[PDB]
């Protein structure tokens, strides 16, 4: 699996959420890529990411769930847990 976290350094919700999402990734031993949409806009533009923060959970480069606009960090944890529960069964 993989977490992709899209941010910019002028986004205050992004700064506050970044250590949480990093801890979540460490907690589940999932790779996490932090992507700055201003510094490196090519891949975000290809993925159709326009707002930050945006969180994409992936497995084998397949998009399991995208979070943008209105979401809490608990929704991200819940999706990761449900996906691992389904996968491990």
TrEMBL record:
Identify the taxonomic lineage of the organism of origin. Answer: Bacteria, Thermotogati, Thermotogota, Thermotogae, Thermotogales
Q: By its UniProt entry, which SUPFAM superfamilies does this protein fall under?
A: Thioredoxin-like
Q: Which residues cross the membrane?
A: none
**A Pfam family in this protein?**
Thioredoxin
State the source organism's domain of life: Bacteria
Please list the residue ranges annotated as the Thioredoxin domain.
6-80
> Which cysteine residues pair off into disulfide bonds?
11-14
Annotated protein name in UniProt:
Thioredoxin
């Amino acid at each position: 699996m993989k977490i992709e976290y899209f941010k910019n350094d002028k986004c205050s919700v992004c700064k506050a959420m970044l250590p949480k999402i990093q801890t979540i990734a460490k907690n589940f031993d999932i790779d996490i890529e932090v992507i700055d949409v201003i510094e490196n806009p090519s891949y975000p533009a290809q993925k159709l990411v326009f707002t930050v923060p945006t969180v994409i959970i992936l497995d084998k480069e397949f998009e399991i769930k995208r979070f943008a606009r209105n979401f809490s960090i608990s929704e991200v944890i819940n999706t990761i847990e449900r996906y691992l529960e389904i996968s491990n069964k």
